[PDB]
Design a protein around this ligand. Sequence first.
Ligand SMILES: CCCCc1cc(=O)oc2c(O)c(O)ccc12
Ligand SMILES: CCCCc1cc(=O)oc2c(O)c(O)ccc12
Lengths: 513, 513
Amino acid sequence: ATMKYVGSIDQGTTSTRFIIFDERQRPVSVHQVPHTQHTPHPGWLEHDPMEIFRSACKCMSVAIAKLRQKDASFRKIEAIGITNQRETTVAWDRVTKEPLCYAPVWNDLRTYDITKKVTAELGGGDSMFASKITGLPVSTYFAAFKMRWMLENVPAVADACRRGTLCFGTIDTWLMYKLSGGKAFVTDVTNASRTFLMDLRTRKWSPELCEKLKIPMETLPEIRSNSELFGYVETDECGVAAALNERTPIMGSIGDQQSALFGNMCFEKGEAKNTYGTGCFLLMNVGEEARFSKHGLLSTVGFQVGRDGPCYYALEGAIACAGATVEWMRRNMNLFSHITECEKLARSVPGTQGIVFVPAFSGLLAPYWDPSARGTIVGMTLKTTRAHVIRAALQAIALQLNDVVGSMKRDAGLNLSSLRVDGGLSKNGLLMEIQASLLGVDILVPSMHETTALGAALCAGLAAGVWTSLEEVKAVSRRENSWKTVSPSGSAMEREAMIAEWREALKRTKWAK
Amino acid sequence: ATMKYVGSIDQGTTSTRFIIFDERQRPVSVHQVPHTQHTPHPGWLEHDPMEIFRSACKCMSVAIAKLRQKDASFRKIEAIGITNQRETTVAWDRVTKEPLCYAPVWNDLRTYDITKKVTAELGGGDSMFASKITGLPVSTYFAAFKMRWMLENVPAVADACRRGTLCFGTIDTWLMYKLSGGKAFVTDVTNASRTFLMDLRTRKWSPELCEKLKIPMETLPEIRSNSELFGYVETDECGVAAALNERTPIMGSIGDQQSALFGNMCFEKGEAKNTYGTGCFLLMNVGEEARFSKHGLLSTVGFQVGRDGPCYYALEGAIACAGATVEWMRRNMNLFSHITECEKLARSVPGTQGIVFVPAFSGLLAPYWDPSARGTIVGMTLKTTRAHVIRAALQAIALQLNDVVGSMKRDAGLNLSSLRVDGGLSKNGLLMEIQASLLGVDILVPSMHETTALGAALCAGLAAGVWTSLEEVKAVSRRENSWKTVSPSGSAMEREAMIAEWREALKRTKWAK
Ligand SMILES: CCCCc1cc(=O)oc2c(O)c(O)ccc12
Ligand SMILES: CCCCc1cc(=O)oc2c(O)c(O)ccc12
């Protein structure tokens, strides 16, 4: 037994990557390819499904080739895992194998009207109507409403449903389909948990809802766990089956945010993760029993290692403008030029001294869904510099995440144990300190940042016996991959003063329509 | 009929100038000398009267020495005019001919307590109790309270009162005293209007107010008009009688703002001036009858040509943060560097696209009155840029002016005829365009921008026959000096939405204490 290897396809909003991990959980090869962000109308975003599948195959054969020149005794990958951008919905044909049309992406707003009609004509105007089934409000994000929009507005996709050809799938299903050659038509529970068609507690499709929303269940794939035989890679798109050499199983499929949870060893209830990027998603493991939300937050599947494995559930909240706020201060406002000046400028001052900046540029998410909320700054005087604004933008992210976490503590009935953080903005020391102070917990910053991709590789390693227990996983991690830990430090009437200010700033934010 | 020349001493907060004008109303010589800003305690400001007097003298003889070197037709100054920082109060002794202490400046805060005590005990808690007599509210600015402060806190002044050698005087009075060698103890109507001791209906000192604030009337100079024989220069302090050569009468005397009103030719009722400086002072001529405000605006004297000539009254409004908001965006927020960029960045976008920036850094003055209001921005999206923010600051300035003008029109019972503009921000044509479009009158931008100095030069030259009427003053300006006219150029519907957004934004500015 020499060095075994597990591959992860990371199919994100703006690019696709393939990372190869070894049995020590180290990324040893990686390759990235971008895809086009088609915006036909304002607020619309579409991806081209064949560009994504193509990107993924290019990623695999370049990653393989590169590893095979740093380890010339590398004959095979044990298994492939997939993690992907969730909610993004593809429509394809049973026999022609091709996309009927482009894939509306998770944050697309073409499903606006369909979202209105549904809440009214099915929920009696209550957005939470189906939420004890799914765990979700009715929104433009989820996969069913996109399914609905295409069936309605796309000649080709209408006919495909008519003829009994039509397949529908999130990006995990699509990738697993095209990688197979048509063989497997499958999804994992976490991904399925975002369709608006799956029962959260049972992890089975709801025939109530599919029929209530007129989606022919012929179009839907078979649900499985995150960690088991899904299919085999055997397409020849960019030499990919050739490059792998042996028949390679796909034994790993898991949505992106939950992959970051799993990748961060957030296995026990209480353990939570935050992924900074353009925005934030926070997910907390809540345990083997599903918890529902009185604050807006989503309930979703955290993970499920194996067919009839214990299924852990989670709560989920988002902030829309996290790293976008920093990048906005830079490129839109000229408040600094170089990425590190941001942090240095915020430190250069002691407080925000009066000011609050609430960066609700595209609305308020979290536990106050106000899409009339806009970007706002209150309390300025002639003493206000860009440093205070910069510092206040970071305080505001951390304050939203506080409001978010507090809403989870009540919904979940337990504390936040600790908080793992990954992404651009977690390299910011000051934000991590402010974040810790307000939550009063440890913030663990992993120095192997590649944890979204690691998630899917863990799934497929467990299912294929590269590791065997979630404990060996925890132990290999602890040994191999270090982490910076940042503790809370500060007062209680600082914390409560900062929030009292925040509460008052939030009243002043309502503006659009 | 040889060339005639009028001189204007322009004694400001931070410096003194002497500008000599020719009969074409052209500035032909200038010299500027600054004086020391004495700050004994935070909030306090004080000027040395003797340093101020010498400055004026230096300015005169230097500017005269320069002119006779560059103009062979300059033989003499026909008359001298004075324009001055108002409200600044000088306590001197009629036998030593010298000050008993330094002079507290208009914006000095050491009179605050005295001011609160006058409001409570003389006004029953009403700061406006004397506003139908004086045109003014109880405030730190006004002369009477500085006079009162100096009796109560300055032994030398209190002694001088007792001994009956005390002269109180605004800077017009101090300058005409010392230029006389102590022979003239006069003030002009406009400066008297800022003492809190003059009755606007009579333009005479109010026996009741003198009695109630306990300033004896023997301390006070004689009230005369803006344009008449005050005195003659007969000091040789810094060579100034030597430089003037012939006997030179002092025949003009007018407070700085009113001077600008008059240098801007606002002789008829409904004609207004606005100075776009660090802040904004807008004065409108309301005609021969005083008008009082229901919106916190000051009623004041505008001008009076001739001993007991017709007396034109004004309303006065201020905005605190004009050029200061421009300076803040550059200095504190790094939105631009070179001053030309402010206008170019604001022109580079076609509107503000929903944002509003209320630059209420030091509160709202003007016709809303909120010391709690702070600098606020609302409505930002990820499309918002420094360009939109800069343009909104400019809109904001014009919007407050619009409101101030609005109030004046209601209080005065008249329309705004035209707006003459001056100060540095008047060279920002986009601001002048936005302002025309908002008020829907023409804005007149004089190219000879020395409007404060010219006021005093016109008063003095009228009295000495250099110009024989206001019609002749107006005609020489047209012929000799260009005015750029700037016309309303947007839509009434855009006008209205800007005002609606402005009114919404104001509701979100309350922050402080
Ligand atoms: C307008 C309702 C949006 C629902 C939403 C809330 C949230 O806190 O996180 C989300 C989220 O993480 C998604 O991927 C999609 C939708 C939401
Ligand atoms: C503290 C109240 C100030 C009154 C005031 C109102 C205004 O509109 O303009 C003023 C002004 O232009 C002054 O020079 C002094 C006081 C005011």
